[PDB]
């Protein structure tokens, strides 16, 4: 019981580190796609004028 609780708690710490690492990647990927979008909508407005 003591070993599993320690191991399970350690795994929960691992999930927090993992979700956090993953969350920051998701935010990062979304931001990059937003930069490309703005750049495109801009170039598109220019090319229409």
């Amino acid at each position: 019981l003591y070993k599993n609780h320690e191991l399970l708690k350690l795994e929960r710490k691992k999930t927090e580190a993992v979700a956090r690492l993953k969350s920051m990647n998701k935010s990062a990927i979304n931001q990059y796609n937003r930069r490309q979008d703005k750049k495109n909508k801009r170039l598109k407005f220019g090319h229409r004028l």
Partner: protein, 44 residues
């Protein structure tokens, strides 16, 4: 030893209840170191 064996059950209860560093461990820590209003008054 021959007087009784009911003490071993208490030892076993404590060893297993302490295993849960959640509600049980927090409660025992608070009690050993030191409607919810009624519970606080009754505890004091």
């Amino acid at each position: 030893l021959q007087w009784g064996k009911y003490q071993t059950f208490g030892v076993d209860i404590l060893a297993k209840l302490f295993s849960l560093e959640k509600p049980n461990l927090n409660y025992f820590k608070s009690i050993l170191l030191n409607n919810n209003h009624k519970d606080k008054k009754l505890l004091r």
